[PDB]
Amino acid sequence: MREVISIHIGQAGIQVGNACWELYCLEHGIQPDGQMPSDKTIGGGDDAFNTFFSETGAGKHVPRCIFLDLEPTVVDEVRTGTYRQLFHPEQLISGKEDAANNFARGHYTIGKEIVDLALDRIRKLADNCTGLQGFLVFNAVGGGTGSGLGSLLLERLSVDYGKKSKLGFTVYPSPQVSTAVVEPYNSVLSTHSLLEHTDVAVMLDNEAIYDICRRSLDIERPTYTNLNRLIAQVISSLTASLRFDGALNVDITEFQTNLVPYPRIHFMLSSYAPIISAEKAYHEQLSVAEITNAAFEPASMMVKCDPRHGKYMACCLMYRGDVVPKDVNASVATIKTKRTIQFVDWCPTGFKCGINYQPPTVVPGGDLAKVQRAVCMISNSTAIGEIFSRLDHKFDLMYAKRAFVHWYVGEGMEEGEFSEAREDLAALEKDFEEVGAESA
Amino acid sequence: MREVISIHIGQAGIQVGNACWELYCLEHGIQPDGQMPDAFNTFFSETGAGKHVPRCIFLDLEPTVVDEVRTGTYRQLFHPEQLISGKEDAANNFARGHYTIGKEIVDLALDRIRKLADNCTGLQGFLVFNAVGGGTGSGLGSLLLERLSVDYGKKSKLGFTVYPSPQVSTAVVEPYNSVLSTHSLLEHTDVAVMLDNEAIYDICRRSLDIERPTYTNLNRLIAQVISSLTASLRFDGALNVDITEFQTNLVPYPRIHFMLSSYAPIISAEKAYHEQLSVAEITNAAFEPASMMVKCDPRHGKYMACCLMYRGDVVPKDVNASVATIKTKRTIQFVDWCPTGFKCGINYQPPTVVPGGDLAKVQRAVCMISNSTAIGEIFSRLDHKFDLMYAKRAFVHWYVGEGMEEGEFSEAREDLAALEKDFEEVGAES
Amino acid sequence: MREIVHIQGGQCGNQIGAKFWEVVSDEHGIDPTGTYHGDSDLQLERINVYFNEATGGRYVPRAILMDLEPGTMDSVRSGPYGQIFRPDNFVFGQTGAGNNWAKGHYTEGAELIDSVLDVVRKEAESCDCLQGFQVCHSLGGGTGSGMGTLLISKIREEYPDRMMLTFSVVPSPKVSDTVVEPYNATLSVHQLVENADECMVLDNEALYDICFRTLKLTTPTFGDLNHLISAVMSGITCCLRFPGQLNADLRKLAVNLIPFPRLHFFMVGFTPLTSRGSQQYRALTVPELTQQMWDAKNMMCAADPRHGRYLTASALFRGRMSTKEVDEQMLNVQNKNSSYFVEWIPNNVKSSVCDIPPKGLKMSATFIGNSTAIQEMFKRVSEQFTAMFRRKAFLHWYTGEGMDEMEFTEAESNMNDLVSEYQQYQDASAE
């Protein structure tokens, strides 16, 4: 049986996951109390819910999730929401005080107490699951908890559960907009933990999703709630192959073995092809050839990087809905021929095609409109090295004057392992250049 | 006919029996006035026309707790002359309950034991309920269990002793009375099951999420273990066990008869719906050290023998697959001289829940009684506290005044040390 | 007219034999009340081998029920097909053995064995011609293993010319039902190697694997396990109760399955087992039964038959089938697997055909296997015994009932002598 454990560390993880679990209950028919009503639609005891839910007792379904954050103010938000009855109360792990945007607090001092309780429920969910296929980590490396407690949980999970894939979705600081000052410190130190522990890592950025929501949904004021809504569609279409049957099913281990040519280069972008409102959908003729061109647009990625500077190394295209296999191959042919995107020279066959059959869902009240087809592009490139490079420059500028270091030093951290992540990140800068370099 | 006699000594003895007999009435449908609106024969005796009388006596020197049963909701249930009281309590003095004030009241105790034994046809064993920390429970319990060995041989006596903890102490002279009772319960009782107060407090705050547990909340889930291990006599089941099943499957040596307890699916009402109580889920939780009723670390020691009482909708297949994973787990260590360490018994009735109780209605349950070498750590903790307090001879003149000799303190300490030496030699590999 | 006296001892013996009389009563057509209601003349022809005629046409089973605790007797009596048994055969104690071999054999057994032989001698004297005694019990317990093995000593003393068919449930490798399994098993096997003429070794761990892997039962009870055990017992007495093209009674099996008097332990297996998910797709035919009965998974013993050579084998085919397909399939399994069979005995396979298949299946087969691989389960119990015996643990409950420690050593020596003869005959080769 196919099932995944979805964990959410930090403030950004809980809000994204609460939008993610909002979408998963609507597809599988789970009501907020945790009970599937059989009389709503025609349909029997399928195993599509078994990927994220576990049938308990009779007619009750609980998520295969944990919610952990040291700050109590985001975990009691779910405890008093529309999904209080959905979760078992133990996997809403709380704490006394937050990590206060300090990576040393999450890794060393406060997060050490809470991580012991975190591994207990991960152990209990692993005994419930028959065959585990992946971990879904939703953390933001800019904050204290997603970078700090995310680093500790990821290190402990690799010891206890070897060789099982962890698909960590991370939000990086934007080059333009930032909500904190010590974000370059937290993001650099989390890069060391994300490097040797996460098997496949998918990048996100607030400004790029801000830009997508500004133009594609023609609304001037995008809130954090609306940003998490269309991130959840990326998570849903990635995992849609395990739940609903399709023409070309793609497992989590099939994502792993086809997109990362080298073990250390596992930082991938994300795209969604049809992101449209209700009024623009009527004028638009949605076809597989058109959305595949829309999937590779420079404005359609959810990370603010320009792919024309780099080269697309390995690409994966997850399709949903009424997608016939004849025109996706025509879509692959057209997207390969044109020169405005460039592939790497040593990978003649770079696309991973996955066609599911279940149409995409829409939550009512969201900005998204119902579309027959969708593409969830997750592709590796050498343009991710630009994202680390600008992040490296802001960290190196704030480290010469040694600003905002005594907060970390007093909380368990030593001075020596600030440069250890700086050296390791600089090794990641050199690797993207030498891998994407041509071979004679 | 399977018939069992239970004796309850002391404040802790009969308060547990208040929760025990509350649960036993609901199991057979007995109303508090004694009217049922053949399986009941083990704990209740049919008297007159339609009236059922429990087969127990509530004996205590302190009258202020016996009359609460005599003025409670179970006024018509118990026979008032079975409930034995006294003028004054033992005042946490072992010498008072053993020589001065316990001598005249135990003669009336053996009178009703003979009356209860003649009424029942086939007696299975004895269930003693006492606390070794208190003066009445240790004092009268030592005298009662001494007389029961010579008068009633070959009948195994289950020992449910409320045992002190160094972390939470309700009285100062708890180390004295527990040490002095150790000689009596070593040579007289056939099977002894320890129970610790603060471990039950920790199970309530962790599993049942109660911030302020009370003594009433402890005794209800204590009675759940007692009703589970005796449930094989009352009702049919797949693998029925007896009173005499426990005495030889769990006791390897005549002085090694101390066992622990664990009730696995102790889940509150709100958490019960989300949790999937599989057989392998509760069997894994049963061997968890958090589920022990005494503060023990079973990973410190080894399991000499284990008994597993299964209730509910449990088949022989999943009880096998659950304990097959237990043996393969590294953290559960069995002793090298016992390759066959498991005893399993399956009952066919799910546990009944008391109205207003903390426990939720569960489909299946596991009560586990296990012999472990880690019990020596519990006995050694009060061994050092007794040694410090006896060295400066404090709190002794209360004992020696009431007919006690001073020289028997070292005799109890030597017998306690002989208990420690037996544990460290059975735990040693060969 | 060749009657079999059926004896059930202890919790395991009463529960298995309750389902044994579930099949036989349904096979012979008698109702829960006991009156005959079969639809064929052949059921009345040999009803006397398991049933005695009583008033009103009710047929009572020729079964003596014995244990030490009335709870299992209450389960047998109050359950379905429980009103046919004679209450005079409901002999039971009150104290209970507590899974103790010494209490079942020395202390408590002394005051009830004189009671159980009184009814057994009454049942033996009533029937005109005995053919054997069929006992079903366990070996890990003390109520049925202790008291039952005592009766094997005395029923052999009174009737030395009659056979013993012991369906004994042996302990499991992965799980122990009782903490004193190797003490009770090694003591009971020593009481079975001399007194019992032949033994039918059963165990639960093979029954768990059969119900899961073949029958696709994810949640089996003992009633599912006892049904498969009861299917074997009806298969052994198939030629006694029904005509066939080649008859083979209990003396026919023992003269062919026992080459040497101490080598009388067999492993069994009921052949046509499948789930309803594969019932329609299955083609039941004598070649298809042949590949199922000889598989290691179908065997109802923990010993893997691939590890040891088969000394002798017996097949009890039931149903309207060609006798040529009976012999050539047993011939073909001998030639295709020659290393797995003992060389110094030619024609290792005993074959018999019965013309009456069981109700619901048009073809069936009960396989009896005498193999030297069955020393593997004996070696494990002896290894578990020596680990417990060297520290003298769980022994004061046994020596406190009047038993000396030298009975344990002689039982262990006979256990080691039993596994020595199995190994030597496997190694020895003719010429």
Add this chain to the structure above:
Amino acid sequence: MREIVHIQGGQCGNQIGAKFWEVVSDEHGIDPTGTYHGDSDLQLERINVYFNEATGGRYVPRAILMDLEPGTMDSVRSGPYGQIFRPDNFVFGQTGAGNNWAKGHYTEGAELIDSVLDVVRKEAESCDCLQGFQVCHSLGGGTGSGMGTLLISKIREEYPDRMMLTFSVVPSPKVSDTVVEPYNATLSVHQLVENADECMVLDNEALYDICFRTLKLTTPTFGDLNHLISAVMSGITCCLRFPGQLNADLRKLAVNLIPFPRLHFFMVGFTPLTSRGSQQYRALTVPELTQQMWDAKNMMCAADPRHGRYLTASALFRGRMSTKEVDEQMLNVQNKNSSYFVEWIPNNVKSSVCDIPPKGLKMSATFIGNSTAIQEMFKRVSEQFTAMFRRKAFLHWYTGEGMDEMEFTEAESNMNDLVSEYQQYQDASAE
């Protein structure tokens, strides 16, 4: 009575086999339930070649479906014409290789290759006179490619005198599904040369080009492609199942086609492919089928056969046909372009005629071709294999489960050997 064992592996193999058993079913006229409902007596004459008799007239196929992920097996089980298979023949795993040759062949292979040989050995021993094995899988994948090369390897060691028909799809130049297609094919081809006896190379965009230009299908799904695969596979066995004027078994086609043991890569095609709007315009004559037979556009392989010479070609005509226009047109096509045929093998074209056509078609033909133009594919797969191996990209898994890079250095050793074998065979000339 020459039966063929069918094994399906991988997502591509199971989906092809699901459509394959629909095409076999209506040719013999069996329903999705399994009972026979055809209107021809000749259908039931040879059903043991692909089916097994069961109780109640049920016909169960000789299919052993197997996969490392249970997801694709669920679709085939739930589909129409999918309940006919035996549930015992659905041997399966749970972990899943996931597009990895080393996982499908070394780590996850070991736990499954013991189970899948047991299912095949049970089925192969039951049937009487084996002819060959029909395995259908992919090569660019890891679940059916690396596992399929393992299963062929063990089945050659067990049945070394029997054929293996390997209908396998290949990586494609135009569109590629997976990134690791060159790695998985190069390792798989090395095991198909030494082990397999006949290999039928199929290609995806050749299937798509046929469905676009010939069939004029606007939206060709995988079922339209898989019906074209099963059109060949029904035509290969047409002489075994139906009588004809020129009977040709698998061994008849094997000895007639391959002159040397290693050169056994073929390329296939089905002749009467016309769009629905062009049925009335086309005349179904023998020269019309031959003109579509030798067309490169009708060929289901990516290799252009104008670039190479046919070493040997095979044609399997079906229907009420005259042997005049069959073999005269084979003479005519050799005389028209003798430069496209190998000179030192005279009379290259081999033809056979079967009396019973496929369902609905008045006449049809299946065209096997052993041409040296297939070297353009093996050079192309070796081109992409050397492109990634020099940079050692996508390599850290294959060396992780224990398959060293020496297994890669030996991979293009034989991959470039066999593309050098086909080139010099074309260049060589007689006298």
Add this chain to the structure above:
Amino acid sequence: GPRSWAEDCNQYRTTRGSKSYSTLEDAGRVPERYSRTNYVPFLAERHPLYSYNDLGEDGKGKVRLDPATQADRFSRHGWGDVSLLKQE
């Protein structure tokens, strides 16, 4: 929008806060799923119809197939018909 601070703080949760997430009752319909199978899952021991004949007669009242979406799945896979080369 809100007319007072009390109304704004009272309707914070049901409009923009923790109760603003979409409910299945608020949704018009649950989408009809394209599952692997409505029969027993392949590797799932704890199933009600595991021992039973789920593909045939025994599961008739309990499988609950969906005809329209099942036929859509079969038509998309190309499994329903073999009429592509029937020629008549």
